[PDB]
Ligand binder design. Structure first.
Ligand SMILES: [Mn+2]
Length: 343
């Protein structure tokens, strides 16, 4: 089985917190993933979110397709729209980004990707927001522990994630309907930290670090991780397990740690029945830049808002959100915000 940890409610930097942080890092370095225990409220909120997702996916496609916005990428993506390593993927997705009203300063100013979630209804909204509040508390604990485990100042990562661009993919994978069962191909996630939850069906596989195996830096053009290793062992089945979430590093943690953590490759196999899952990304602030922690003389950076916006424009090039960015030249706002700051 995967390793399982219980996180303290508060992380203070005591020697035992540092020891736990070291154990989390070791588990990522050995297995690529670990489990964290959920308490009764965390578990209840997870199950409610999955139930809301199932109910929404039963709504007619005409209704689901109306849950879209030209200000934010939040909302519905039909099956077959996302592509991994050139092949369309199978799940239907509702993406929840930061839910900002039109009166928020950033929405008023037209910042790309900022706007109100096009929620299907208030009951779904409440289920997702409550769940994401708990996921965020866990993400902050994890990032303090990770800093401590590397002997870094406790707030090294959480300074970047203040008002972070946290977002969640609420997924339904269809049952297998032919010889094809690649629900999503092998890939690595583009963000900082991933917390994943799933129902009891099963289908997620992850790749641990492999001694001697070359890994691409997926944040760079020309070093895509997509499709790599898909048909070669090892792939660990993430067995559905009551009372846990799983946690793995994304591309930005690989970048910041110089590869001491690797962004965990993962893929999904369609089951013989539908599968519900949620993938939560605990992210830097839209205005924050990731930087190499252990190479002080390296000048490379990842500006998070640019990273996110470019990714979503490339993945959803015909969505009304992308069209409006182009029509109103909203990328110019990112250039402007990068100004008068200390690089
Ligand atoms: Mn993924």
């Amino acid at each position: 089985n995967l390793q399982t940890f219980e996180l303290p409610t508060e992380v203070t930097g005591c020697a035992a917190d540092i020891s736990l942080g070291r154990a989390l890092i070791q588990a990522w370095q050995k297995d690529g993933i670990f489990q964290i225990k959920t308490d009764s409220e965390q578990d209840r909120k997870t199950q409610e979110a999955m139930a809301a997702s199932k109910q929404f996916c039963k709504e007619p496609l005409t209704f689901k397709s109306s849950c879209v916005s030209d200000l934010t990428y939040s909302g519905y993506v039909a099956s077959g729209e996302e592509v991994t390593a050139g092949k369309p993927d199978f799940p239907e997705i509702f993406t929840v980004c930061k839910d900002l009203s039109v009166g928020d300063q950033r929405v008023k100013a037209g910042w790309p990707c900022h706007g109100p979630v096009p929620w299907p209804n208030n009951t779904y909204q409440k289920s997702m927001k409550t769940f994401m509040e708990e996921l965020g508390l866990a993400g902050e604990r994890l990032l303090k522990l990770t800093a401590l485990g590397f002997e870094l100042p406790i707030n090294t990562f959480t300074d970047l994630t203040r008002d972070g661009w946290h977002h969640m993919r609420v997924l339904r994978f269809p049952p297998q309907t032919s010889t094809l069962s690649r629900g999503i191909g092998a890939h690595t996630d583009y963000g900082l930290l991933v917390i994943a939850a799933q129902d009891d069906v099963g289908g997620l596989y992850i790749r641990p670090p492999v001694e001697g195996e070359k890994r691409n830096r997926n944040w760079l053009p020309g070093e895509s991780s997509a499709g790599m290793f898909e048909h070669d062992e090892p792939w660990t089945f993430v067995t559905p397990t009551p009372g846990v979430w799983t946690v793995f590093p994304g591309d930005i943690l690989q970048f910041m740690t110089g590869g001491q953590l690797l962004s965990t490759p993962h893929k999904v196999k369609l089951n013989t029945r539908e599968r519900f899952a949620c993938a939560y990304f605990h992210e830097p602030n839209f205005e924050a830049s990731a930087y190499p922690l252990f190479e002080p003389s390296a000048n490379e950076r990842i500006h998070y808002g640019e990273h996110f916006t470019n990714m979503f424009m490339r993945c959803y090039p015909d969505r009304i959100t992308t069209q409006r960015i182009n029509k109103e030249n909203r990328l110019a706002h990112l250039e402007d915000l990068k100004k008068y700051s200390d690089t």
